[PDB]
Design a protein around this ligand. Structure first.
Ligand SMILES: *C(=O)[C@@H]([C@@H]1NC(C(=O)O)=C(S[C@@H]2CN[C@H](C(=O)Nc3cccc(C(=O)O)c3)C2)[C@@H]1C)[C@@H](C)O
Length: 357
């Protein structure tokens, strides 16, 4: 293998491989893209009971990293004139017209600032009918637009509206329009039966395989392979190489919309001035930032040099993605067991700080 192949292999063995034994993770896939060259590393088992090893065809649940595709879909619809970010959801979901949630605009939904949407729906909201009822019954609390609270319902409503604006269901927005535009071959909202042998099992804290809520797809419902996620990073590092409609979509997800301490909220992606200190990257996943409302501040001028990342999990999968435009580099980690977000962020910080230019 090439000297770079061996260097990156050593850095990933040094920084990511020990995490498998440390947290009893059955399988992991780690990818690096640098200067348009992709490097794939696979460890362990996609399914413990089948002794099937993780490989380039293994499909992982991306969990909350799915929001990056919802963001891209929204950027796509906005730049085709199908929505404006100043629109409100009742323009598209007519049953929300003349309700209080129709006072929140689409950008505020996409970036979690409605002022009264928590991490998850209430436990009793279990069906699509009940989701619509929930949004009709919704009342504001904190001043609309002023407080960020990370929220699956919030970006789920944004995704539902994006789909309505494109006259197709959300799963078709991704599987027929967005994934093909990005060149992805094995990314899914619904994994077909022909791929089930490649669909990894996820493992809980007792290392047992389990296998969603309503309106979940835009918030946490995408599945993908390591080669597809490296392709997605390639698109984010080189949007100018893609046709205009998806190029504009991608660029839209890189624009910071407001600031919370050292973090800038873009669409889906979290944005930081580059270089970001390790503490800044860790702070973005603190309990205060992730679970509580935080007052936003308007951006004076966007940082001159930027980097981006996103964590995400399900109860049984973990994901991390990060990229640095100036260095033409990015990294993806997929696991079929959760590990602490700080471990994912620290390991990727070590690798990207050590790789030779
Ligand atoms: C991300 O979008 C995804 C969450 N991310 C993470 C993570 O650690 O990266 C977790 S971890 C853990 C698993 N389930 C918990 C959860 O969802 N908490 C929660 C908070 C408030 C209400 C409820 C509820 O009523 O169900 C649950 C956190 C998690 C997978 C989720 C938000 O989709």
């Amino acid at each position: 293998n090439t000297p770079k192949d061996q260097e990156i292999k050593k850095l990933v063995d040094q920084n990511f491989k020990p995490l498998l034994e440390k947290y009893d993770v059955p399988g992991m896939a780690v990818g690096v893209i640098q200067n348009n060259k992709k490097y794939e590393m696979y460890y362990g088992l996609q399914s413990v009971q089948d002794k099937k090893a993780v490989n380039s065809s293994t499909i992982f649940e991306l969990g909350s990293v799915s929001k990056l595709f919802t963001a891209t879909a929204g950027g796509y619809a906005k730049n085709k004139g199908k929505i404006s970010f100043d629109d409100t959801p009742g323009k598209y979901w007519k049953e929300l017209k003349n309700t209080p949630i129709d006072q929140v605009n689409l950008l505020q939904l996409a970036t979690y600032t409605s002022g009264n949407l928590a991490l998850q729906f209430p436990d009793e909201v279990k069906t699509d009918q009940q989701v619509l009822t929930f949004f009709k019954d919704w009342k504001p609390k904190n001043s609309i637009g002023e407080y960020r609270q990370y929220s699956n319902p919030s970006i789920g409503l944004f995704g539902k509206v994006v789909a309505l604006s494109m006259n197709k269901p959300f799963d078709q927005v991704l599987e027929k329009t967005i994934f093909p535009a990005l060149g992805l071959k094995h990314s899914y909202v619904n994994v077909p039966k022909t791929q089930m042998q490649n669909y990894a099992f996820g493992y809980n804290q007792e290392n047992q395989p389990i296998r969603p809520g309503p309106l979940g797809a835009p918030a946490y419902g995408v599945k993908s392979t390591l080669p597809d996620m490296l392709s997605f990073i390639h698109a984010n590092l080189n949007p100018q190489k893609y046709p205009a409609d998806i190029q504009r979509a991608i660029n839209e997800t890189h624009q910071g919309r407001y600031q919370v301490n050292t973090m800038y909220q873009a669409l889906g992606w979290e944005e930081f001035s580059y270089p970001a200190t390790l503490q800044t990257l860790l702070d973005s996943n603190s309990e205060q930032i992730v679970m509580k409302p935080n007052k936003v501040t308007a951006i004076s001028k966007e940082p001159s040099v930027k980097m981006y990342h996103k964590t995400g999990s399900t109860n049984r999968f973990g994901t991390y993605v990060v990229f640095i435009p100036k260095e033409n580099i990015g990294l993806v980690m997929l696991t079929n067991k959760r590990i602490p977000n700080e471990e994912r962020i620290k390991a990727a910080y070590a690798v990207l700080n050590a790789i030779k230019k």
